[PDB]
């Protein structure tokens, strides 16, 4: 970690470095490592939309319902940006849908606050 708490896994999962992720995880890098803001490598992977990274993170036991300082879970971030394939994979690994951020808007309240007709279909199917 540095002055922010970011690990090589955070930054590899953020900027789509799959080969760097698979290697760090083979040699035992903490998947649930949080930075100073509570962001896990799964948070940043769901944010940028690296599907292959999101699955590899989960396959090593990634906390799928972790919360950062702002109260967002990887399901919130995969939804706000519209990475629908990642939205599915999270739910298929037990992503809780009722998580409320500091503002109180859940995953379904974000599919509504932006009128995402695509997301509303998957979010309850």
């Amino acid at each position: 970690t540095d002055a922010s708490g970011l690990t090589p896994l955070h930054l590899a999962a953020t900027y789509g470095h799959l080969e760097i992720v698979e290697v760090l995880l083979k040699h035992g890098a903490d998947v649930n490592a949080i930075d100073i803001m509570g962001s896990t490598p799964l948070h940043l992977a769901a944010l940028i939309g690296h599907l292959e990274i999101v699955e590899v993170l989960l396959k090593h036991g990634a906390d799928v319902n972790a919360v950062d300082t702002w109260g967002d879970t990887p399901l919130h971030l995969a939804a706000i940006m519209g990475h629908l394939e990642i939205v599915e994979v999270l739910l298929k690994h037990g992503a809780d849908v009722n998580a409320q951020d500091k503002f109180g808007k859940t995953a379904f309240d974000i599919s509504i606050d932006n009128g995402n007709e695509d997301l509303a279909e998957i979010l309850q199917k």
Binding site: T14, M37, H43, L47, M81, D113
Partner: protein
Amino acid sequence: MREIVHIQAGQCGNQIGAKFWEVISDEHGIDPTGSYHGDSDLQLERINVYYNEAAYVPRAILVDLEPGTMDSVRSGPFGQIFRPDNFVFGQSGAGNNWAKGHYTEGAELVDSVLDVVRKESESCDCLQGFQLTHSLGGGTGSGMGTLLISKIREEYPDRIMNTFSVVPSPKVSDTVVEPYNATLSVHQLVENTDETYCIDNEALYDICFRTLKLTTPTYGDLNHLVSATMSGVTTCLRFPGQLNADLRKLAVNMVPFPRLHFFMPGFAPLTSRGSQQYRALTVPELTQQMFDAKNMMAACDPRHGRYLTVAAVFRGRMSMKEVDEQMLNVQNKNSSYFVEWIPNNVKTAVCDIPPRGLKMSATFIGNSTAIQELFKRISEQFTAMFRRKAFLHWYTGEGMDEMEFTEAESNMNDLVSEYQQYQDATAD
């Protein structure tokens, strides 16, 4: 108020710009050679606006940092008609970075563009204004475009600045820094352009998918709707009409407040690429399909906001009296969705010449407060990435301070709040 200088910047700018010049050159009876082969004289009545005299050449400037689209346009069907000297294309690209186009490598090329801009302006009897096509989610059209706007603004402070800005969406391009670029670009258009047509790609995609029933829409499927919409909103400018003749008269009728100059265009009927839709829709149909959300080029529900000003343009031989009855009806039957404190805010024009392929068409231009939904959508994606400062090193590495992101985010939310402010104002 006569001649209009057209500019296309970036990948998307030169794409929809070349497709727009194909459309109007045909409507004005101009073949790729530049010669006139039309029949009616109304085509040549106001050809001086977009074209120059030859021995007809478009008054268009083509800009991009990447020379890729330079050759894709010249290899196009109408690529031989543009002036060779009007191609201003740099060496390196923009990498879909607003800061590279606006601050770094676009500023190194912008002086070359203003030299071509000046050239086309000196040969104008009376320059009416400028017209820009670009994408807000890109790097060159977003970054270098807003720089070109602010540069033209300081050199031509008396001319209208009009833009055709397309909005990024996850349903099309998968680049994640597009909310950054669009937020930084909207932060410029709100303070530099006199009028801006919002062309949402999420709306264009939903139209090709849910209305034209195309499973996998391509950019040609999307740019077909853009060229049709651009041809309609420019009809009154190139054909001898009475209402909204020049750029300023249109802006004086459509922009009640300076920052609220973001228009929600519509068009009917929604045709496909080379399909069969012969039967010219009736006037009551053209009016119903004009005022719906399924024909808006912007992902906003007009039911969620109020229309400040409205400009409707009908094309084709039809009963002008039957048009007034319909345009009156939709107003007094949906009076809650029209601002009371602006009397006669809806204005309808008629043009005898239809677009090539149809007998009756109708183009909608609305200054609705529902356009805040579009900015709310972009502002949500912007903050989601910005809270984690993802990819910020792109823009800081090109000189931008982190504060510039906070300001552009703040001014966009101010623009949203203002659109809500007049959505709640009453008459009493």
